[PDB]
Design a protein around this ligand. Structure first.
Ligand code: BCL
Ligand code: BCL
Ligand code: BCL
Ligand code: BPH
Ligand code: BPH
Ligand code: MQ8
Ligand code: CRT
Ligand code: HEM
Ligand code: HEM
Ligand code: HEM
Ligand code: HEM
Ligand code: CA
Ligand code: CA
Ligand code: CA
Ligand code: FE
Lengths: 40, 280, 319, 258, 317, 60, 59, 57
């Protein structure tokens, strides 16, 4: 809390793009290792 | 003699079970109805024991009999004479001493009380001391009884009394796993930590940095509110203390009252009830 | 029948006091201090906030690492099966390197994690002593904790860097688990004579006692005369009063001599420090010095002598 | 070790070490022990011990300089002190004999209810305002959410019969702990500070019994100079009174039971 | 994970092993010492022997262990060597339906050896086994397979190929404690040194890894447990090594810890071949012999009752 | 949610902050708890079966 | 999908708690991986190749 | 990289800073170890030659 609707939606947006920043950098991470050393 | 300000507290009386007779001082000690008795036992011990030092193992002649604190020790009677007066030479004497020492701590203990009264103070002191007193009974009385043997207690050896534990301790192999001994130990530790803090802090506020004011609680109550985050408080420390210690004792007390008359297997085992839990 | 200061009967509260502000360098304190009626029914019910500098974090970090090792490797043991991890908890642990790599970096397996984790409970522990002297005087406070902390931290190193590494043995250094650690002390007593004979232990004891004794007295004493602001020692140290009047007097007409609302707090800080001091002493001698303290003892005329109702035989001689 | 000289090695040296510096530091303390209250007063008896030195084996230490807080004089120790009065008569001339509290002991200000004359300046908080104050100025406070508010609890003599009631419970800016309770007595219609330390709570009947002094004694209770704050001097002053009650409030108490 | 007060009501046992007031003492719960006896009871021997007759190597096609025995006496043996062993399965347990000279049964093969075991023992290690000697009832106590054997403990599960330490666990093997949890195999089976006390006060002698005495412990634990007596019993604690200080019992245990070396590294071990899997261990092995195997938490299996004395064919001739 | 439609009410007695945050943790832990309890005995793809060759075969 | 109605999230949940809690979780969790994995067969440090440059060079 | 700047308006930069510095100090002290312990103990074991083995002897 501590905020209104305005400042709220703005955060959420940028905050997302930053999260997909991870998933992508980590998924691409996994994949690179997946190719090298296959787990399972 | 008297302290700079003691001269003004030595009221008259305040005694417990009588004592308005010997209700006076000597040097800086109040006598009363207990400072008197305790003394008796003291010499009829501190010296009665000397006889022992004299006598020794075999006899006062045996090359075994010595006069080195490190070795001198009065040994309790054989488990033979169960709950009966043993021959001083064979055991009784030991009992005798122990007989005394009991009162000498029961007197001085009470004497403390009369005092606590005179100086119109709180009695936390004696009450505390009692535990410590007790732990000495439930470790040469409460136990040996539930073992039918007086000689089944411990010795009075400068270091000799050490082994007495060494054995009775191993009598359960890894005594260490005794649930009590664990906690009771833990306390005798925690105490030796908080103490190493309070007595430290204080001596770090009343005598702080160079060219600095005798700091106030407004620091103390934050000193740890910073390092560790929270501060038990000031009044508190003088609580947690007695707590820890007055517990540690009473604990250990349990610790060896149950070891034997309440448990015969090696402690390590006791710890089994755990394992066998219908779960893991 | 007088309210014996047991648990602060009726309590009261006022806003969160974030302590005296700090100079130029001491980062902002942190936390939104809380209250707990219960905790508070014993002491300052307020909770926090707490400081966190560099060593503050730096140390804490180096802390929850060894834990995340000595913690991990341990769980691994009972093949990541918590259920038993929960069962064989008090038994589990993480042992040091095998006598081979006496000092060499143990492999990622054989006692490796322990040397790893160890060093991280070697720094963070030493770093936290910094998180004291630092946050200590930056309060305008002298140093007596920082001091003792060493005395203690000394002994800890007498159980590692200074001795285990002093005898070339990534083994001679205590394990890492309640029981096993509970065993190391056991094992030790044996491997070398029987500690009950190394004075510096039979010594370090009397202390662990005294503290168990004194801070146990003065804790009461204070209380006894806590009505007369005894608890307020602070000032009593400066401006005396009936507190230190009634108190010390007690011990005066008791054990004779006595001292001051100041002095005591001294012996306090002392017995304490003079404990871990004597601790690490014996533990340091015992190893690279005397090998059997029992022999030592008697060889010095120390160890006692009793009769002999039982004795045995010796295969290595008759056979 | 008791005989003389036997074995000879290294470690046994060190045991001598510590067990030497100990007997040194032991003295250090001794001295530091003596700061206040020294030297002794009378000759009712001599120094009990091995070596009966003039006044304590460890030569009294030197003056210590206590730099008090802002707006505060400076204290030192040792620091010669001006002899006090002894409102009492020795039951016996014998050294070590007790001193009877002439007149009314309850206030005769002796032993069971004696006290020193601490500075007559209310001990303040961190910045300035005085620590111990009544809940009057202590308006920024609040009873512990839960604990039954003592404001309105009728005090009750150790004799049982009522003895006034309460008012403001003197809190503190340093530690949210109650240290005193205003007791608007019954006969005096005045205000007598109640030392919580001596106040036993009875949250069941709104009462607050104090087995320290009879209901009446609340009249002889040292009166507070100012009601909005109390100085160290009196901080000891109010207390010491009730204290006496412990050995005065009844002929019984003081005298032995068996 | 909680504080406790003894779960046994007093008063307990009371053996004064040492001088009046010195240490070594022994405490036991009567309420158990009881059952444990009323349960660890010996089965009365067979009626008198024949004394008559020739031998058995004579009349019987093949009888090597009991050749000197008169038919009758010899038969007593078979009967005994049945009730002591598998009186559930009958004679056929060690024999083939009819043809009794057959050695087509691994049970017999070994049974044979078990004989060379007992006797050899009963006569050559009488210093440990003394006059009570041992029978089949001992380890087999009315059971074909001794409930008290011991295959080298594998240890607790392995974390992805990674769990070398063999100390931390807690296993009845050691009265319960984080210890080797298998001091046996490297001791009772093999024969790793057991001493660790430094011979001289100062250093420059015993370079034994603490870890080494760390193992002796476990062992010692087990031992102490097997018989069921605190280390006080054989030791003078402060003097775990000073024999001159120990008690008779000690030495009397010394050998034992070798008669077993024997029994395992000489008998129960070899016979692994004829032994199926169901008696083999994971690391591939033969349920050897712990002190517990016989003792079963007692000082003289069946508390001194001497069954073996009533059987002449159970002593090396 | 045939019945869990009239639940709307709950929120006032169940603080949002208390219920939201606290449950996101119970999950954050159990997450590991399961994977650990299962990873422990059931099957261990990590050291259960191939690919586990490179470790032994690929090593020396 | 989720994002549009998920900005309202920060309307009850403080930005600091999420920013602080997540870092702590991602790293400790990240660590408990290579970690629990490293000790697993697919170890990479001392397990297999490249060619035993240690075994070769050493001796 | 564009929008990443706004983070400084809610979190104390000094905090994250000292937070990061302590994080990279242990890790590095960790890694060099977590590796030097297993992967390749480049310090003692393979090179350059054994001045101690072939020398001391
Ligand atoms: C066999 C070796 C075993 C072992 C066997 C035992 C045995 C056996 C016992 C203990 C007991 C105790 N052990 Mg252990 N213990 C071991 C290892 C440890 C370790 C350790 C770090 O390794 C620790 C910390 C402890 C800690 C403890 C304490 C919890 C406990 C109580 C001590 C005590 O203060 O009684 C407090 C005692 C008193 C207050 C009485 C003395 C004071 C009297 C009243 C006054 C004397 C006045 C004098 C005569 C007058 C002259 C004036 C002079 C100036 C003094 N043990 C090993 C594993 N332990 C004991 C226990 O549990 O007791 C309850 C006990 O019996
Ligand atoms: C068992 C054999 C399989 C396997 C089978 C499974 C199965 C079956 C499941 C998983 C699941 C998971 N497994 Mg898996 N898994 C395997 C191997 C792995 C390996 C590995 C290195 O080998 C890893 C790293 C993982 C990792 C994971 C996680 C991604 C996932 C959920 C974890 C969790 O509890 O968080 C928990 C939750 C929370 C912290 C919060 C709740 C979530 C909510 C909706 C949104 C948060 C809202 C919040 C209030 C808003 C603020 C935002 C921020 C918090 C600030 N698995 C093997 C191959 N795994 C689970 C899964 O992923 O389901 C989809 C699952 O069911
Ligand atoms: C196991 C087999 C492979 C391998 C496979 C993988 C795989 C697969 C992955 C990694 C990943 C990582 N590996 Mg690896 N790795 C191997 C061997 C190694 C070795 C080694 C010495 O041998 C090392 C040191 C590492 C080290 C690392 C880390 C650098 C990295 C992240 C872990 C993490 O928890 O992030 C957790 C994250 C955080 C705590 C931070 C939060 C992230 C957000 C987006 C940023 C915060 C925003 C904030 C508000 C802004 C302020 C900025 C600053 C904080 C001031 N690997 C072997 C060879 N490794 C992971 C990775 O790098 O993905 C990209 C990954 O997915
Ligand atoms: C948790 C409680 C701790 C504690 C508390 C405690 N001790 C106390 C007190 C308190 C509160 C006191 O008030 C009292 C005190 O000092 O009052 C001024 C005291 C005290 N604690 C003392 C000792 C002591 N406390 C110990 C421990 C503890 N005391 C605990 C740690 C220990 C040990 C070994 O750990 C000892 C040795 C005394 C100095 C003093 C009580 C003095 C007293 O009453 O003495 C009476 C008797 C004599 C002076 C003469 C002795 C003559 C006897 C006939 C001989 C007895 C022989 C003895 C049994 C053999 C000893 C040989 C051993 C080496 C085997
Ligand atoms: C005679 C000296 C006595 C003594 C003195 C002493 N101890 C001291 C000091 C002193 C003077 C300090 O100044 C220091 C202290 O408290 O400073 C504030 C301290 C201290 N004594 C301590 C412990 C301690 N002292 C002991 C003993 C003693 N200390 C002696 C009796 C003992 C024992 C063995 O009895 C212990 C266990 C610590 C409380 C503290 C030193 C703390 C320290 O160095 O911490 C470094 C940092 C960390 C360990 C990081 C912690 C990580 C997180 C904050 C916690 C997260 C949870 C945790 C990982 C649990 C696992 C959960 C998982 C699921 C994640
Ligand atoms: C051959 C030969 C020599 C033979 C010997 C023959 C002999 C001598 C025979 C005689 C035997 C006899 C009768 C011996 C008894 C003699 C007597 C009476 C000895 C005194 C007994 C006694 C209990 C002495 C004290 C024991 C000691 C030193 C215990 C140490 C424990 C310890 C550290 C105590 C601390 C003491 C202190 C400093 C107390 C003061 C003190 C404390 C504790 C506060 O808490 C406090 C709180 C607030 C304000 C002030 C104070 C304060 O001043
Ligand atoms: C899987 O784990 C999860 C994720 C579930 C988290 C849980 C973790 C848990 C529950 C962890 C629990 C840990 C416990 C219970 C630990 C208990 C530890 C105990 C009881 C320890 C007791 C004693 C320890 C001692 C004495 C340690 C001493 C260590 C020393 C002396 C280390 C010294 C290191 C040095 C000197 C390093 C020097 C650097 C080098 C080696 C390079 O110098 C050559
Ligand atoms: C009560 C039923 C049993 C009977 C009637 C019986 C009978 C016999 C007979 C007649 C022989 C000698 C045969 C020969 O080789 O010529 C013999 C030998 C033998 N029996 Fe049995 N037996 C019985 C039970 C057992 C059991 C239960 C065992 C198992 C341990 C056993 C073990 C042996 C052995 C080892 C020999 C060889 C003797 C030696 O080498 O000294 N028998 N038995
Ligand atoms: C002289 C009397 C004894 C006889 C006749 C006897 C007979 C046998 C037989 C027939 C077996 C194999 C059972 C099967 O699996 O089919 C066996 C196994 C065994 N015996 Fe004995 N035994 C005797 C005494 C003992 C004693 C005194 C011990 C104890 C130290 C002992 C220890 C064992 C062990 C450890 C096994 C292996 C367990 C198995 O594979 O079943 N035996 N014995
Ligand atoms: C569980 C408690 C026990 C512990 C901690 C223990 C510990 C030890 C230690 C450390 C040694 C080696 C001393 C040296 O030479 O350096 C030892 C030897 C010995 N112990 Fe024990 N012991 C225990 C119980 C027993 C019991 C109950 C017996 C008796 C049956 C026993 C019999 C022996 C014997 C005969 C030796 C010397 C021969 C040898 O094993 O190498 N011990 N013990
Ligand atoms: C290493 C493990 C073993 C140790 C340390 C050990 C130790 C001892 C000791 C010290 C005694 C004498 C007790 C006393 O004097 O009252 C004893 C007696 C005895 N042991 Fe063992 N033993 C072990 C293994 C065995 C085994 C494997 C057997 C079984 C075949 C066995 C059978 C017996 C018997 C029957 C007695 C009683 C003798 C008598 O009544 O005097 N022991 N043992
Ligand atoms: Ca270990
Ligand atoms: Ca796989
Ligand atoms: Ca290298
Ligand atoms: Fe204090």
């Amino acid at each position: 809390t501590g905020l209104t609707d305005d400042e709220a939606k703005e955060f959420h947006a940028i905050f997302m793009q930053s999260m997909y920043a991870w998933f992508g950098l980590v998924v691409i991470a996994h994949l690179l290792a997946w190719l090298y050393r296959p787990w399972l | 003699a008297m302290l700079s300000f003691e001269k003004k507290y030595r009221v008259r009386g305040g005694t417990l079970i009588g004592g308005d007779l010997f209700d006076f001082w000597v040097g800086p000690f109040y006598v009363g109805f207990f400072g008197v008795v305790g003394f008796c036992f003291t010499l009829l011990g501190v010296l009665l024991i000397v006889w022992g030092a004299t006598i020794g193992p075999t006899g006062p002649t045996s090359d075994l009999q010595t006069y080195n604190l490190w070795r001198i020790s009065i040994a309790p009677p054989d488990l033979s004479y169960g709950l009966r007066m043993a021959p001083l030479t064979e055991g009784g004497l030991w009992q005798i001493i122990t007989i005394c020492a009991a009162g000498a701590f029961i007197s001085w203990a009470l004497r403390e009380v009369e005092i606590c009264r005179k100086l119109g103070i709180g009695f936390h002191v004696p009450f505390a001391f009692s535990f410590a007193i007790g732990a000495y009974l439930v470790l040469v009385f409460v136990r040996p009884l539930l073992m039918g043997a007086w000689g089944h207690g411990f010795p009075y050896g400068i270091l000799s009394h050490l082994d007495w534990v060494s054995n009775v301790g191993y009598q359960f192999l890894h005594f260490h796993y005794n649930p009590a001994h664990m906690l009771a130990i833990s306390f005798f530790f925690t105490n030796c930590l908080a103490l190493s803090m309070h007595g430290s802090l204080i001596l770090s506020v009343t005598n702080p940095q160079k060219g600095e004011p005798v700091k106030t609680s407004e620091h103390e109550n934050t000193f740890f509110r910073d390092i560790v985050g929270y501060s038990i408080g000031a009044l508190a420390i003088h609580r947690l203390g007695l707590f820890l210690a007055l517990s540690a004792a009473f604990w250990s007390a349990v610790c060896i009252l149950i070891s034997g008359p309440f448990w015969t297997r090696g402690w390590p085992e006791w710890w089994n009830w755990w394992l066998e839990l219908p779960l893991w | 029948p007088e309210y014996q200061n047991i648990f602060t009967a009726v309590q009261v509260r006022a806003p969160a006091y974030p302590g005296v502000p700090l100079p130029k360098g001491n980062l902002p304190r942190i936390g939104r201090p809380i209250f707990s009626y219960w905790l508070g029914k014993i002491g300052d019910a307020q909770i926090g906030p707490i400081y966190l500098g560099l060593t503050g974090t730096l140390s804490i970090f180096f802390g929850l690492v060894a834990i995340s090792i000595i913690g991990f490797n341990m769980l691994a043991s009972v093949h990541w099966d918590v259920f038993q991890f929960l069962k064989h908890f008090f038994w589990l642990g993480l042992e040091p390197p095998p006598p081979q790599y006496g000092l060499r970096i143990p492999p990622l397996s054989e006692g490796g994690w322990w040397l790893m984790a160890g060093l991280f409970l070697t720094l963070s522990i030493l770093l936290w002593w910094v998180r004291t002297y630092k946050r200590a005087e930056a309060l305008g406070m002298s140093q007596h904790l920082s001091w003792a902390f060493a005395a203690a931290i000394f002994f800890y190193l007498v159980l590692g860097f200074i001795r285990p590494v002093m005898m070339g043995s990534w083994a001679k250094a205590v394990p890492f688990g309640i029981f096993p650690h509970l065993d190391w002390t056991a094992a030790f007593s044996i491997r070398y004579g029987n500690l009950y004979y190394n004075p510096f232990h039979m010594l370090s004891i009397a202390f662990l006692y005294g503290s168990a004794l004194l801070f146990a007295m003065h804790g009461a004493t204070i209380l006894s005369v806590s009505r007369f602001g005894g608890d307020r020692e602070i000032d009593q140290i400066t401006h005396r009063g009936t507190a230190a009047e009634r108190a010390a007097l007690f011990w005066r007409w008791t054990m004779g001599f006595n001292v001051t609302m100041e002095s005591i707090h001294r012996w306090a800080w002392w017995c304490a420090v003079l404990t871990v001091i004597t601790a690490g002493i014996g533990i340091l001698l015992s190893g690279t010095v005397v090998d059997n303290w029992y022999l030592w003892a008697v060889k010095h005329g120390m160890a006692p002598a009793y009769p002999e109702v039982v004795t045995a035989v010796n295969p290595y001689e008759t056979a | 070790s008791a005989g003389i000289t036997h074995y000879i090695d290294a470690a046994q040296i060190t045991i001598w070490a510590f067990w030497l510096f100990f007997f040194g530091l032991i003295i250090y303390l001794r001295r530091e022990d003596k700061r206040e209250g020294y030297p002794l007063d009378s000759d009712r008896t001599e120094r009990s011990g091995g070596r009966v030195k003039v006044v304590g084996f460890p030569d009294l230490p030197d003056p210590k300089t206590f730099v008090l807080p802002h707006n505060g004089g400076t204290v030192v120790a040792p620091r010669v002190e001006a002899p006090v009065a002894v409102n009492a008569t020795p039951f016996s001339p014998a050294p070590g004999s007790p001193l009877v509290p002439n007149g009314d002991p309850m206030l005769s200000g002796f032993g069971p209810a004696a006290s020193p004359d601490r500075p007559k300046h209310c001990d303040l908080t961190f910045e300035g305002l005085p620590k111990i104050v009544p809940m009057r100025v202590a308006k920024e406070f609040s009873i512990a959410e839960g604990d039954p508010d003592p404001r309105g609890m009728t005090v009750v003599g150790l004799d049982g019969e009522v003895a006034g009631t309460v008012s403001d419970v003197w809190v503190d800016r340093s530690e949210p702990q109650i240290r005193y309770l205003e007791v608007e007595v019954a006969a005096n219609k005045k205000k007598v500070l109640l030392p919580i330390g001596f106040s036993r709570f009875d949250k069941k009947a709104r009462k607050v019994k104090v087995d320290a002094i009879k209901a009446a004694h609340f009249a002889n209770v040292p009166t507070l100079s100012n009601p909005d704050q109390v100085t160290l001097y009196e901080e000891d002053k109010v207390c010491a009174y009730y204290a006496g009650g412990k050995l005065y409030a009844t002929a019984e108490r003081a005298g032995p039971l068996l | 994970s909680v504080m406790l007060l003894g779960c046994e009501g007093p008063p307990p046992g009371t053996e004064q092993i040492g001088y009046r007031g010195v240490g070594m003492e022994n405490y036991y719960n009567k309420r158990q010492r009881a059952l444990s006896i009323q349960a660890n009871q010996p089965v009365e021997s067979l009626p008198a022997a024949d004394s008559t007759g020739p031998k058995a190597s004579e009349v019987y096609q093949n009888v090597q262990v009991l050749k000197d025995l008169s038919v009758g006496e010899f038969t007593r043996t078979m009967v005994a060597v049945t009730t002591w062993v598998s009186p559930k399965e009958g004679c056929n347990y060690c024999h083939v339906p009819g043809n009794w000279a057959s050695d087509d049964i691994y049970t017999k093969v070994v049974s044979r050896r078990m004989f060379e075991l007992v006797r050899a023992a009963n006569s050559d290690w009488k210093a440990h086994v003394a006059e009570t000697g041992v029978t089949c009832y001992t380890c087999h106590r009315g059971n074909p397979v001794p409930k008290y054997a011991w295959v080298t403990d594998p240890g607790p599960k392995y974390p992805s190929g990674l769990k070398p330490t063999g100390q931390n666990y807690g296993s009845k093997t050691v009265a319960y404690a984080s210890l080797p949890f298998d001091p046996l195999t490297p001791f009772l089976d093999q024969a790793n040194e057991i001493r660790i006390t430094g011979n001289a006060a100062l250093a420059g002698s015993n370079p034994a890894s603490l870890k080494q005495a760390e193992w002796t412990f476990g062992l010692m634990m087990n031992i102490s447990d097997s018989l069921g007596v605190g280390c006080t019993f054989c030791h003078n604690t402060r003097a775990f090594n000073d024999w001159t200080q120990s008690t008779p019992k000690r030495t009397t245990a010394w050998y034992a810890i070798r008669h077993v070396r024997d029994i395992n590294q000489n008998y129960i071990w070899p016979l692994n071949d004829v032994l199926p899997a169901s008696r083999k261990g994971p690391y591939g092995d033969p349920l050897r012999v712990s002190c517990m195997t016989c003792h079963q938490a007692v000082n003289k299996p069946l508390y001194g009752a001497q069954m073996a004395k009533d059987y002449p064919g159970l002593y090396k001739t | 949610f045939t019945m869990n439609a009239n639940l709307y009410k709950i929120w006032l007695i169940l603080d949002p902050r208390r219920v939201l945050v606290s449950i996101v943790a119970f999950q954050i832990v159990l997450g590991l708890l399961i994977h650990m309890i299962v990873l422990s005995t059931d099957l261990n793809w990590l050291d259960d079966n191939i690919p586990v060759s490179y470790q032994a075969l690929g090593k020396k």
